[PDB]
A paper describes a structure:
Aberrant CDK4/6 activity and dysregulation of this signaling axis is frequent in multiple cancer types and it has emerged as an actionable drug target. Of particular interest, phosphorylation of CDK4 at T172 (pT172) is critical for generating the active conformation, yet no such crystal structure has been reported to date. However, the protein structures of CDK4 reported to date exhibit a conformation incompatible with catalysis and binding of ATP or ATP-competitive inhibitors.
Here, we determine the first x-ray crystal structure of active CDK4 in complex with cyclin D3, in the presence of the CDK4/6 inhibitor abemaciclib. Residues R14 and E74 form an “electrostatic belt” around the activation segment.
Residue numbers in the entry:
A (entry chain B): 11 to 216, 220 to 255
B (entry chain A): 2 to 38, 46 to 81, 84 to 107, 113 to 255, 262 to 295
The structure:
């Protein structure tokens, strides 16, 4: 009645699948920093405020883990090419969550549910209108590759047993959500956010840290020094997320 | 300057809407149009367009090419997908009489599905109507409204694939993955020789019975555990129409009950038959 997707070894073990994601990911990285040249009214702290609001909606509705970072991907790509005013941020963020949920969830968010969390002046008509507007500006290219998509592939390449991964996965998910709330990670390749979050999670739970960083970098073809700096930034952002 | 494609033929109708052959009256060029029929956009439309947009970055020769997506608007908005036109489907291609072509057709069919699977995409609706063939003989996979990116631990839509091409694990309401498309491939491979559907069941239980009549009843170590209908509900059956030796071997590896032992699209392309 309600099946869940198991771990397909035909996918996790086929190196071409991981290579395909690595080739696709740069296509979905937001162009440049829209805060200096494109957005004027919208400031970085406003994005962080909106991100926490979006994350709370996704948490309170128990969305799948990909929905929030995917919605943030739509938000950043939209703001990279459409000047927007502060008063429209909430409506934009609500629509990004709606589209991400419709794409990835068997039981997705609805326009009526989003009206619980939006201020009362926002209406279903506006949400319907902005869904179409955002789709148009993103060219309907919603099947983005985000960091969570790499999680299962990387964990498959650790010999840590499937059961012992349970807490690693849970803890890594905290770091993945954190990165999406923080604009300093907005332009990192999703594969680096994924390996950095896994590295921070496996280290935080306690075969050494340097060997693991070496392995995590080798899995994705990343420079070791670049992965080490990203993981340290991720760890620092968590401790300072205040 | 703007041009307009005008519809000149209806080529399909579904709950998803209508597909049209369309023609620019000033250039004579053809496309195919697929028109979409608190609320918001339909989930199937958002998914189909998103998957095609992701696949458009590769320009693979064995998948239909999405050219454009027009949303126009009155209270109701109409979404129109524009595809490069293909002249026919696999059924129309066959009733035009060689085995040499079937191997090349099968080669292209497997290449397109392997490209989907290698891109984390499961089709979940493979059938002769969704397999198109250009006038030059190039296979083009179509209809991605039921397709999804497969992500470990995500919830799955329990009932997928049309009845006659549905895999046993789905018929038994078990979980499933990429092998579901490979079961449809086996059914389509055999249908190119039979020119008639292999398993024309009357229901889900009738479909499993027709399946077990040819593949034989799996023992017990192969029966899925997350199903309610047990193995003792079906009668015992044994295995075993005019294809080759090695072709029958390749067919049985596609029509394997256990999806974990079912041949992949990649390994089938490496088969001695092709
Ligand atoms: C009335 C029966 N007669 C005789 C049989 N004939 C079959 C036939 C079917 C299709 C084409 N051409 C074509 N070219 C490019 C495309 F992209 C699609 C296309 C795209 C999509 F997105 C689709 N989504 C769905 C559900 N379909 C189905 C319609 C397959 C899609 C098809 N179709 N030429 C012939 C129709 C006329």
């Amino acid at each position: 009645h309600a099946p869940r997707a198991g771990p397909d070894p035909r996918l996790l073990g086929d190196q071409r699948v991981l290579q395909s994601l690595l080739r696709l990911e740069e296509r979905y990285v937001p162009r440049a920093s829209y805060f200096q040249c494109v957005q004027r009214e919208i400031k970085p702290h406003m994005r962080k405020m909106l991100a926490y609001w979006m994350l709370e909606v996704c948490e309170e509705q128990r969305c799948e883990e990909e929905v929030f970072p995917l919605a943030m991907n739509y938000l950043d790509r939209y703001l990279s090419c459409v000047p927007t005013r502060k008063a429209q941020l909430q409506l934009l963020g609500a629509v990004c969550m709606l589209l991400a949920s419709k794409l990835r969830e068997t039981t997705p968010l609805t326009i009526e549910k989003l009206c619980i969390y939006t201020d009362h002046a926002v209406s279903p008509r506006q949400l319907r209108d902005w869904e179409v507007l955002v789709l148009g500006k993103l060219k309907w290219d919603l099947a983005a590759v985000i960091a969570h998509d790499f999680l299962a592939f990387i964990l498959h390449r650790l010999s840590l047993p499937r059961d012992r991964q349970a807490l690693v996965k849970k803890h890594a998910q905290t770091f993945l959500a954190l990165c999406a709330t923080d604009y300093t990670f907005a332009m990192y390749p999703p594969s680096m956010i994924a390996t950095g979050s896994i590295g921070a999670a496996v280290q935080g739970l306690g075969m050494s840290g340097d060997e693991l960083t070496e392995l995590l970098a080798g899995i994705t073809g990343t420079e070791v020094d670049c992965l080490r700096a990203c993981q340290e930034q991720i760890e620092a952002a968590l401790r300072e997320s205040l | 300057a703007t041009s307009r494609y005008e519809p000149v033929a209806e080529i399909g109708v579904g709950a998803y809407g209508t597909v049209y052959k369309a023609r620019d009256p000033h250039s004579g060029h053809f496309v195919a149009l697929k028109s979409v029929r608190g609320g918001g956009l339909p989930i199937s439309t958002v998914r189909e367009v998103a998957l095609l947009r992701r696949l458009e970055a590769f320009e693979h020769p064995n998948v239909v090419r999405l050219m454009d997506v027009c949303a126009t608007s009155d209270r109701e908005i109409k979404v129109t997908l524009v595809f490069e036109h293909v002249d026919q489907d696999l059924r129309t291609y066959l009733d035009k009489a060689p085995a040499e072509t079937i191997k090349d057709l099968m080669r292209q069919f497997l290449r397109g599905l392997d490209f989907l699977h290698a891109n984390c995409i499961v089709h979940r609706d493979l059938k002769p109507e969704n397999i198109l063939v250009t006038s030059g003989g190039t296979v083009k996979l179509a209809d991605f409204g039921l397709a999804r990116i497969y992500s470990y631990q995500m919830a799955l839509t329990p009932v997928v694939v049309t009845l006659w091409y549905r895999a046993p694990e789905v018929l038994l309401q078990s979980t499933y993955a990429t092998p579901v498309d490979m079961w449809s491939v086996g059914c389509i491979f055999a249908e190119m020789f039979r020119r008639k559907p292999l398993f024309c069941g009357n229901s889900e239980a009738d479909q499993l019975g027709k399946i077990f009549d040819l593949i034989g009843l799996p023992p017990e170590d192969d029966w899925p555990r997350d199903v309610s209908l047990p193995r003792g509900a079906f009668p015992p059956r044994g295995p075993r129409p005019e294809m080759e030796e090695s072709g029958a071997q390749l067919l049985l590896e596609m029509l394997t009950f256990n999806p974990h032992k079912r041949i992949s699209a990649f390994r089938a392309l490496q088969h001695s038959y092709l």
